[PDB]
Design a protein around this ligand. Structure first.
Ligand SMILES: [Mg+2]
Lengths: 232, 443, 76, 166, 86, 43, 122, 58
DNA sequence: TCGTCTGATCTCGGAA
DNA sequence: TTCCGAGATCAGACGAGATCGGG
RNA sequence: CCCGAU
């Protein structure tokens, strides 16, 4: 409880949320489904840099009620964050110049990082790209649940959102799921199929099964969404 | 003893300079330290450290000796540096015991540190002739007569043989014929002689005038045959006492013999152990008389009577009320004069015990007051350090409005009130330090 | 010249760390980008095209150093 | 005037990464050390040259580039042996005010040493008679910060004779 | 509350004080020598000078300081009146 | 003891809020912009 | 911003003037209004400074003169500060060297002082 | 607790750039990390980086 | 809640 | 006889996952 | 402190 072991090392953290988890196999291993209501609250200060000027202008007209939007603008010189609810958003949209900060919502393609609270090894914090889905559960792919040691029996796990752009790359490169597929005790892979996928693919690759071009093009064409829809 | 080191920083700052103080005071703070290590830790260039140690070995403040590494570790003796405070008093008793010539002998011996005979007689042949009448030139032969006359009573002793180590360089220490041999002053002989004035003033202001003179002539014929480490003087017979009396006296042998057995049997007790032990308590008693009035001084003498009989008699043995007395005890306790309750033998209980008895311990009350008197002269000099740098504009105008001159005579009233008061607390140091040295074995 | 000629995962992270934060303060972009608004996605386009104005100062632990251009390294 | 070798850690913000450093540091250092007296140094003016520019770090925070810069800048500091030429931009009864031409109106001469026809009697009398020359005499600067001017000078006028103008 | 008013006192005045400038007559002799040697110890050869002032001065120029009967007869006597130790 | 500790490791750089030197803070980064130690002017 | 070297003066008025003349006309080539909301003190000092130096007719003053005058100066034995005064002051007439000039005492001789007038006029 | 004592002693080690593994105070613990300087993470089965039968058939 | 390490007194034993 | 040093025998310490939720 | 979640 003292300042050393609990206020200097283990200190509480802003831009961080916590829900109950539920599965979603229809995501890539690298993505967590974040609820809308959470993604409208957790914000990333994205500075305006000649490439996101039209993108941040488009989203600051939405404001803090439509999801791809924002809820704070700092001006270029430490002006107090302008809670973008009361004023004219279009007058703040047009007056938005280079340099200043927009605290846009947690949008898809942003880097959040999980944690399951009894952290026992390196793999309990992992980064994830964030896709804003429609629910209030943190939904991830079930292959990445044995690193978290997370079953879906009512388990909760935290979601931090790194603010600076330097801490965004340190999540993506070092702690991404595409990087930490392999535990550092053995070298074994920890992210691999669990439960149904194993007993699915065993029952499919079993010697007895035979599919006609009816079922064969149906099972195969399941694998064509989400970076996979553009392959012959 | 940090306040002691506060003075050695102050005493060298006023006399020689600032870096000779800095390299000096650091050597008091880190001790046996080589030449390169001193220049690296004080952040001083090596050319200035060689000069600063050169002045410091001249005035005999830093002593050098090598043991094992073949590299000389300089070392400064702390208690010598405070003897600079007594320097004009060392001048004066050579005017009461010798002429103006020999008084100037110990002066330039104290000033320029190490001197040969061939130089110091040549210097006083300049200073004494320039103040005497031209054409009536002071002849230097009388100087050489009074020069040895100091040495037969052993007021000036010679320097110990130089180590002449390779690291030490002979050419730099002398300041630029005959070589000769060097000496400092024997200030240790003075600390006998200053003690000789101390006991003779202790008897004359207590017993009688004729009692003190036979103490003086006892001690004047016991000078060479003792040292400062003598626990008491050499034993004498009463028959050479009648031989050694001055010619001013006319007392018959048998009446002074009655005073001789009177003076031998006192509460004071020549026991040089008991003499400085009795003079130190009067120095303590004159401080509580200075500070807490005669009423608290009355109970301060009461604990010097009974060792551990207190608080069940001190309300009775001085008859002063219990309210007024017990604030005097706790003020003597909080200022560390009353020492403490070293008799409580009930186990670990402030409330339930065998009743704590006050008891003065003479040395803990001594070493504090010496540490206090070291602190005192720090507050004296720093004020005279303070009032000097402002008023420099009008010292050279004489070399002027009505408040301009009035600031000078209030300055010169102040400095002369400060500088006289550096010496009046200085006599408390020696009166207590000689008591400190008298109870210190293996030194 | 003596350290590893492979860009470590801790050097790729910080080079992408600060080239993202540089380009999010209107730095000049070196890759004639194609609509990427995430500054981090621009920086990986900078790395793969091997145009990053950054030199890694590699500290040997005695105190000596050894420079390495990000052009002059083998990324994965 | 005197050169002063100085060392500064100059931070270039990352939107100036197009321009060359030795120019874009110089544009910063002029905005850092112009019209500013440095205590015990003098009045800095501009940048003479950048004698040594060392390597551009980029720190874990800012993302900017911090180059430690050795340079030389010309400063204004009279050498206590200069007969300058200024203009009287003011006259006070205790002493005249001279100003070097559009340089600094902060040189305040005390006036006690010129020929025994000396007074300023508040009707703007320069001197009771028998560009203006000046002898800068002492250095005098006071560091301003004191709680939660600054190069003033004292300026003399001896028996120069002043053949052209009295 | 009994003392919760202010700093106890600016100073505490002791009803008894110092006696005097004690030993008044005779320290006129030592007291001038206090100031006499201090006039001569400062103006001695055994002192140091602020050569850091001259390395501080880059204004060095000419015409400034920064730029710029013993009546006795021979004899020789060397006495060992003193110790023969150390 | 007058213990002068430097601030190293990670249990102190996290307490002090310095970027730790273990891992991504081991090295440091330079910039590759147009610069040179130039010639001065003749005085 | 620690100043390592407090002094190093040989900057004759022409040198500083010339640097300023190149600087003033060079800063405007890149003169910026983005930095106006930041810094503008530099402009004022350089601008006004040019005028005071301009007072001395360094207009028509040449770079070679610095060495040419210096070659004559070394023979006179005047100190470096004195010569800078001699170039910067540019004593127009003998009276300034005769009286205003520094170190008049002793070194005047009514010989090289007359020669100096020929050198200063040159 | 045993996780806490372990990581509160072992946290300030990193393999420096000349392949040595030192403490925070500069003192060397290992001269190469683990004799070969190899990641256990990337390490193949049998504590060998290759398992050459698999690579040759691949 | 012992569990641990520390460090503080006693005593039978050898050297001079 | 001496005893100086050393192996033996008590007493005190300050430790003992992580988070989250409500009365 | 209890309770409860994992
Ligand atoms: Mg569970």
């Amino acid at each position: 409880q003292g300042r050393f072991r609990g206020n200097l090392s283990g200190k509480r953290v802003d831009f961080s949320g916590r829900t109950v988890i539920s599965p979603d196999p229809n995501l890539r291993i690298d993505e967590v489904a974040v609820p809308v209501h959470v993604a409208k609250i957790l914000t990333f200060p994205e500075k305006v840099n000649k490439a996101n000027i039209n993108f941040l202008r488009k989203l600051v007209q939405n404001g803090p009620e439509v999801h791809p939007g924002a809820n704070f603008i700092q001006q270029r010189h430490t002006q107090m964050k302008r809670f973008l609810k009361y004023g004219n958003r279009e007058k703040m949209a047009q007056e938005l110049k280079y340099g200043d900060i927009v605290e846009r919502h947690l949008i898809d393609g942003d880097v959040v990082l999980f944690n399951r609270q009894p952290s026992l090894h390196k793999l309990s914090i992992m980064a994830h790209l964030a896709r804003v889905k429609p629910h209030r559960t943190f939904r991830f792919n079930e292959c990445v649940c044995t690193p978290y040691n997370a079953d879906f029996d009512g388990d909760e796990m935290n979601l931090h959102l790194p603010q600076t752009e330097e801490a965004k790359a340190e999540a993506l490169v070092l702690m991404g799921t595409k990087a930490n597929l392999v535990t550092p005790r053995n070298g074994e892979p920890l992210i691999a199929a669990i439960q149904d996928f194993l007993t699915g693919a065993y029952l499919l690759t079993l010697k007895d099964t035979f599919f006609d071009r009816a079922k064969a093009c149906q099972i195969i064409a399941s694998i064509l969404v989400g970076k996979d829809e553009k392959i012959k | 003893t940090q306040a002691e080191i506060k003075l050695c920083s102050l005493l060298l700052q006023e006399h020689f300079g600032e870096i000779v103080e800095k390299i000096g005071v650091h050597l008091i703070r880190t001790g046996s330290q080589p030449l390169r290590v001193i220049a690296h830790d004080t952040g001083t260039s090596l050319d200035q450290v060689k000069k600063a140690l050169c002045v410091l070995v001249q005035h005999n403040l830093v002593s050098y000796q090598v043991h094992k590494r073949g590299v000389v570790e300089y070392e400064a003796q702390c208690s010598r540096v405070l003897r600079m405070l007594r320097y004009p008093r060392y001048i004066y008793t050579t005017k009461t015991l010798y002429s103006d010539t020999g008084e100037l002998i110990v002066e330039e011996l104290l000033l320029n540190g190490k001197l040969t005979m061939s130089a110091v007689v040549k210097k006083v042949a300049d200073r004494l002739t320039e103040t005497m009448e031209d054409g009536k030139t002071m002849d230097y032969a009388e100087v050489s007569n009074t020069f040895v006359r100091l040495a037969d009573t052993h007021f000036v002793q010679r320097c110990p043989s130089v180590p002449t180590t390779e690291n030490s360089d002979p050419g730099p220490p002398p300041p630029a014929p005959d070589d000769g041999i060097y000496w400092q002053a024997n200030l240790d002989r003075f600390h006998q002689h200053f003690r000789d004035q101390a006991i003779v003033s202790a008897v004359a202001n207590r017993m009688d005038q004729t009692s003190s003179e036979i103490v003086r002539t006892m001690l004047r014929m016991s000078e060479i045959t003792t040292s400062s480490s003598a626990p008491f003087t050499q034993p004498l017979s009463s028959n050479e006492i009648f031989r050694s009396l001055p010619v001013g006296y006319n007392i018959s042998k048998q009446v002074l013999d009655q005073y001789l057995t009177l003076l031998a049997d006192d509460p004071l007790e020549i026991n040089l152990h008991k003499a400085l032990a009795s003079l130190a308590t009067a120095t303590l008693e004159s401080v509580v008389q200075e500070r807490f009035g005669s009423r608290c001084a009355r109970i301060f003498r009461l604990v010097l009577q009974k060792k551990h009989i207190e608080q069940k008699q001190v309300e009775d043995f001085a008859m002063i009320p219990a309210k007024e007395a017990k604030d005097m005890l706790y003020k003597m306790l909080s200022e560390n004069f009353m020492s403490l309750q070293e008799i409580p033998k009930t186990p670990d209980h402030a409330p339930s015990r065998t009743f704590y008895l006050y008891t003065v311990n003479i040395l803990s009350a001594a070493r504090m007051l010496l540490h206090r008197c070291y602190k005192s002269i720090a507050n004296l000099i720093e004020r005279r350090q303070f009032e000097t740098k402002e008023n420099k504009r009008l010292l050279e105008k004489s070399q002027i409005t009505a408040p301009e001159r009035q600031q000078l005579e209030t300055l010169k009233r102040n400095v002369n009130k400060l500088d006289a008061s550096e010496i009046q607390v200085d006599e408390t140091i020696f009166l207590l330090e000689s008591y400190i040295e008298c109870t210190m074995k293996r030194q | 010249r003596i350290t590893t000629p492979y860009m470590t995962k801790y050097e790729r992270a910080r080079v992408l760390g600060t080239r993202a934060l540089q380009i999010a303060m209107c730095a000049p972009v070196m890759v004639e980008l194609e609509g990427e608004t995430d500054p981090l996605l621009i920086a990986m386009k900078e790395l793969k095209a091997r145009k990053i104005p950054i030199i890694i100062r590699r500290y040997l632990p005695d105190g000596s150093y050894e420079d390495w251009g990000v052009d002059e390294l083998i990324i994965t | 005037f005197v050169l002063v070798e100085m060392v500064d850690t100059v931070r270039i913000p990352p939107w100036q990464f197009e321009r060359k450093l030795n120019d874009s540091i110089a544009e910063e250092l002029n905005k850092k050390l112009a019209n500013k007296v440095v205590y015990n140094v003098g009045l800095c003016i501009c940048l003479f040259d950048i004698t040594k520019l060392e390597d551009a770090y980029v720190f874990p925070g800012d993302g900017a580039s911090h180059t430690k810069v050795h340079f030389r800048c010309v400063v204004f500091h009279p050498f206590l042996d200069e007969i300058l030429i200024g203009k009287i931009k003011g006259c006070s009864p205790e002493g005249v005010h001279v100003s070097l031409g559009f340089f600094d109106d902060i040189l305040i001469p005390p006036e006690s040493l010129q020929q025994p026809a000396k007074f300023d009697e508040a009707e703007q009398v320069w001197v009771w008679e028998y560009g203006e020359e000046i002898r800068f005499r002492v250095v005098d600067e006071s560091f301003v910060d004191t709680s939660p001017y600054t190069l003033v000078g004292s300026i003399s006028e001896p028996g120069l004779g002043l053949l052209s103008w009295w | 509350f009994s003392k919760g008013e202010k700093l106890p006192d600016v100073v505490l005045k002791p009803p008894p004080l110092f006696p005097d400038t004690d030993y008044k007559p005779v320290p006129l002799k030592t007291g001038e020598g206090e100031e006499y040697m201090l006039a001569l110890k400062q103006e001695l050869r055994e002192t140091m000078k602020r050569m850091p002032y001259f390395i501080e001065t880059p204004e060095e120029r000419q015409d400034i300081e920064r730029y710029s009967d013993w009546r006795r007869l021979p004899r020789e006597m060397m006495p060992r009146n003193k110790c023969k130790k150390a | 003891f007058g213990q002068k500790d430097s601030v190293c490791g990670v249990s102190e750089c996290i307490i002090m809020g310095i970027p730790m030197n273990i891992g991504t803070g081991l090295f440091k980064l330079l910039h590759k912009a147009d610069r040179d130690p130039n010639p001065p002017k003749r005085p | 911003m620690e100043v390592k070297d407090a002094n190093s003066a040989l900057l004759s008025n022409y040198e500083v003037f010339q640097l300023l003349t190149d600087l003033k006309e060079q800063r405007k080539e890149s003169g910026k209004n983005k930095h106006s909301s930041g810094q503008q003190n530099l402009n004022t000092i350089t601008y006004e400074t040019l005028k005071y130096i301009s007072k001395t007719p360094c207009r028509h003053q040449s770079p070679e003169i610095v060495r040419e005058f210096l070659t004559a100066l070394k023979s006179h034995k005047l100190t470096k500060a004195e010569k800078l005064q001699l170039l910067n002051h540019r004593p127009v007439t003998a009276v300034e060297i005769q009286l205003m000039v520094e170190e008049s005492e002793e070194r005047l001789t009514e010989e090289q002082i007359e020669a100096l007038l020929h050198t200063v006029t040159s | 607790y045993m996780q806490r004592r372990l990581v509160k002693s072992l946290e300030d080690l990193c393999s420096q750039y000349d392949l040595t593994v030192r403490s925070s105070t500069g003192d060397i613990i290992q001269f190469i990390y683990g004799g070969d300087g190899l990641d256990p993470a990337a390490m193949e089965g049998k504590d060998e980086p290759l398992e050459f039968k698999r690579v040759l058939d691949n």
